[PDB]
Amino acid sequence: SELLVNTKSGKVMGTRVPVLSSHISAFLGIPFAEPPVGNMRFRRPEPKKPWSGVWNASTYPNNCQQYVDEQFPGFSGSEMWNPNREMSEDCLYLNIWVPSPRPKSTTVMVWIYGGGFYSGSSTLDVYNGKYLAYTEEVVLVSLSYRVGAFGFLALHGSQEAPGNVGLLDQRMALQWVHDNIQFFGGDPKTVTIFGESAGGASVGMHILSPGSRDLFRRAILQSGSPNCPWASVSVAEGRRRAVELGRNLNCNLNSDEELIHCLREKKPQELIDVEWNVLPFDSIFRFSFVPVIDGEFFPTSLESMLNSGNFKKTQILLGVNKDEGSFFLLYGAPGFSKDSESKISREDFMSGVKLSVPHANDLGLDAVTLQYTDWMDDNNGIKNRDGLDDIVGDHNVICPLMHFVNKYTKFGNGTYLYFFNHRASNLVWPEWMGVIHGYEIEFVFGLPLVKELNYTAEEEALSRRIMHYWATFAKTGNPNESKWPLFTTKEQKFIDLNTEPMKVHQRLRVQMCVFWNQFLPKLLNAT
Amino acid sequence: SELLVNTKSGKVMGTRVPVLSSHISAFLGIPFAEPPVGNMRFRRPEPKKPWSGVWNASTYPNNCQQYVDEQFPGFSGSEMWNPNREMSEDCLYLNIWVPSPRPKSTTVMVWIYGGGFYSGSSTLDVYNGKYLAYTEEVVLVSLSYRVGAFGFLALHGSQEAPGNVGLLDQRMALQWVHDNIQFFGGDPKTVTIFGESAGGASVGMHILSPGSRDLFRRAILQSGSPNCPWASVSVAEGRRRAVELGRNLNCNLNSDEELIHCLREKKPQELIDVEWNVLPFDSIFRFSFVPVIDGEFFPTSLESMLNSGNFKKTQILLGVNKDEGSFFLLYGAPGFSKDSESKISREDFMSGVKLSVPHANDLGLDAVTLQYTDWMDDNNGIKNRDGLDDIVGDHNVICPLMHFVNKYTKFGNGTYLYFFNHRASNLVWPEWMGVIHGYEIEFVFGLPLVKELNYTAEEEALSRRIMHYWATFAKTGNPNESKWPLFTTKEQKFIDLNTEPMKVHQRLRVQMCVFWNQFLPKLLNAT
Numbered sequence A, B: 001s002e003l004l005v006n007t008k009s010g011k012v013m014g015t016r017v018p019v020l021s022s023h024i025s026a027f028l029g030i031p032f033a034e035p036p037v038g039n040m041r042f043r044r045p046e047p048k049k050p051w052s053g054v055w056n057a058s059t060y061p062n063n064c065q066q067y068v069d070e071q072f073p074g075f076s077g078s079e080m081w082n083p084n085r086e087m088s089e090d091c092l093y094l095n096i097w098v099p100s101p102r103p104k105s106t107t108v109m110v111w112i113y114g115g116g117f118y119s120g121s122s123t124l125d126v127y128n129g130k131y132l133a134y135t136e137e138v139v140l141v142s143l144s145y146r147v148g149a150f151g152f153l154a155l156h157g158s159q160e161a162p163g164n165v166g167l168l169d170q171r172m173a174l175q176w177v178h179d180n181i182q183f184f185g186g187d188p189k190t191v192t193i194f195g196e197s198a199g200g201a202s203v204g205m206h207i208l209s210p211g212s213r214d215l216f217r218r219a220i221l222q223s224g225s226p227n228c229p230w231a232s233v234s235v236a237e238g239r240r241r242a243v244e245l246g247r248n249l250n251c252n253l254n255s256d257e258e259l260i261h262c263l264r265e266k267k268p269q270e271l272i273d274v275e276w277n278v279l280p281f282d283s284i285f286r287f288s289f290v291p292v293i294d295g296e297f298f299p300t301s302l303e304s305m306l307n308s309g310n311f312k313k314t315q316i317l318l319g320v321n322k323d324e325g326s327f328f329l330l331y332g333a334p335g336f337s338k339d340s341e342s343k344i345s346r347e348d349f350m351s352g353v354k355l356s357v358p359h360a361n362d363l364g365l366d367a368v369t370l371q372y373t374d375w376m377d378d379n380n381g382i383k384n385r386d387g388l389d390d391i392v393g394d395h396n397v398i399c400p401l402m403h404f405v406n407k408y409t410k411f412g413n414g415t416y417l418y419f420f421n422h423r424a425s426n427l428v429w430p431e432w433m434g435v436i437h438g439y440e441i442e443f444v445f446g447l448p449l450v451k452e453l454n455y456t457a458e459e460e461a462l463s464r465r466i467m468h469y470w471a472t473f474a475k476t477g478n479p480n481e482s483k484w485p486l487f488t489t490k491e492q493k494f495i496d497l498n499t500e501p502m503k504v505h506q507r508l509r510v511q512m513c514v515f516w517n518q519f520l521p522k523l524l525n526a527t
Ligand SMILES: *C(=O)NCCCCCCCCN1C[C@@H](C)O[C@@H](C)C1
Pocket: A069, A070, A071, A114, A115, A116, A117, A196, A197, A198, A199, A276, A327, A328, A331
């Protein structure tokens, strides 16, 4: 049976799914690790013991235990990212979409979802890539990991809760792919891992981490970097804010053992309830429990590794969205609302920049402002709003990416950089949000291909042409078969990704990023 | 006799001069102070004892003792500002151009030449305002003062050499005007003082200085401000760099008395020879001996006075030139030459900015650079050159003026601000220098009126219309009789001054000056 597959972990039964006038097979819910429940909570991932029967992979599995959004109940735009299956601590599983008839050795793609490391799901409608596997003819794999304290609590030193376990799940899922993806038709030596936000930062974290580079070939990073300010905390910070969690749930903090035990006694939702209370400051685009530069998963500091080319060298295709910051300002800054032009005032603006560069001192905040302010019309509300939408993206996404790009592209074997700036015609979010964080994925996963979803023809055509870029690159190591230029430390070329005739530019946000990537940091140290 | 005049200091014989197809009288060389020679050197100005005969004022007098330029021998563009009469320590005199027939009470104008306080002359061809008095029908007065150490050596405490004596000469010349300008037809209650560079900074220094505000009515400041970085030094700096002068001429520095005496023994040219050796750093647009915030001529710090409206409140008309910095870069920065496009390299540029903001630390120099650098084409030589021509002007002229403007225009009775940006058609300097420091004066003095000087008709028309602005303002307190808007702390309007139909703008170099006037200073203190 085309749906019956024999893995190194046991036989597994798949299911036939319809895909744009055709059909293919999907093996949903396959388990790659032991349930991270109970005493194992906070512990590193555990390999999944073999099953002596036939595992049923016809239905998506539970979503991990995570903070669910309720700022816009009903509203699809928000609920569209919320978990869509019974959340549970038993969540480490993976789904595989295999073409039909089943291949013998085709390009494999492994997807790592985002969520600020505090949220995420592999079972999201937008992540349903039966279209990618289908259209592009690849074997799409959707790994899943532990987000939240459940998978990032960093009580460094302790072995019961060392941190980064969530990245470890990611890794134990890439091994499984490396070990059995052949029995599914995939080619274990041509496996591309691609992700968004925290998933894009995880991708590159696997390029840096010595223990996982050998587990994949090339990578695609979307709106994320490992050297992103919110992508990691120190072992001290993780420690300090891990204790603050015990303190919040009234735990015993006499010693790690007591704490860890206590935290392991609290139900999941109790941890979730006081999760955000441990952050060091009032901030925008900052999350509680994220990877720690522990010295193991990460030999040394990220920068120093990017400086010594101490990272996996291969091909990488990456980029950013035109309007990243939007989502975090509407959700955190004062003066923003889902149902207005949210034109901001010098005040609200000045107050937002403090929420954006939280680690900045007053001289710093000054630099930022003077930098993103049209002093010829400093009262423009639409300007104050947009310039604020630029500080959130620039500082948290584009600039940290452009530094990892320039550093990688000096040891890597090839780099392709894009700037996606097309506003889905059916977006529901207020126009003032522009090309929003995470709204390229739908083009990447070919949702514009399914009619009922309301997309122009021009749009379905971008998805189709973007999907081939991703897929062609994943298989050949180059997006091309009209040409998307190679990014070089010399002519830093990149292109635009939208329904208009390909246009090639060069040096994505140089200026703003020279300030973020070079000036600000310096200043903030002198001062 | 229309040329025979009786002043409070004695009878004086003038001379008839031809002015554009007509004639008027000029009383040149009238003395307003006692020869500042010998033991009086460095001492404050001394009133000129009365003369028991008829003083001959038919010929320009000596130019003060000053550093003469020899970087472009022959070349008019440079020699045009050099002294044109036997330099001498006996130089405190004034020249008066009176219309003919002689008025009974007309608007008076007193001109204070520039020179970085180290140079200057009242007898310069460009300063020959027989055209202003003529055309505009005013009584033009050309005061003269002591420049150099000869008139600015600041051994504060000492009474033999207290400093600012040069400003004191300026003052003793304004008194004389206030006391006898009536006998020349002038109106002592409608006397405007106007100047360029150091002369524009002196103008406003007389607005701040309590002891001179009552000596004039309104003021015109051109390319200068009292709060200009090179316009003054502290009493410590003047002291320290005054001693360094003795040290340079091998004087005894056991005590003030010895030093002062010694300095008083050296011939003038010996002082001049080692003059520039006392500056604290390698710099551009910085001069040795300039006014000191001594606590007498200046009650307190300049800023604090501009903050407490502790200054003469009246009308003021002022402005800046499109390309100020030019002259100082060609004369001091590496990569510049009188006979080339002087396109600069990131290097030469980076090295020039250090010459421009000499008091800046490395974090500062960084801020400046990042601020005046197109990181999208950081190698543009024409850009590197111009952006460097902007840092010299911005930081040394426009910005310090725009801060004194905004501060004054909050206690003053009216403010008119211009931006002169027309390149004389007959300029000899390399085009890369644009609208150069001090090249508006010729329009202000109506040189475009004399044919033989080669000027378009469009040009003679600007001079004529600019002269009326100056004169009409000097008499009415308003430049107008098509309208030049009043500068207000609200809509900071100003206009352009060139042969094209008047255009009104608003907020001269806000952005760049928010950095110079606000950010940089802050940073440079935090750091
Ligand atoms: C990449 O991983 N980006 C993170 C994606 C998260 C979307 C923005 C929402 C984050 C802001 N939170 C703040 C907490 C306190 O409340 C929730 C509702 C929104």
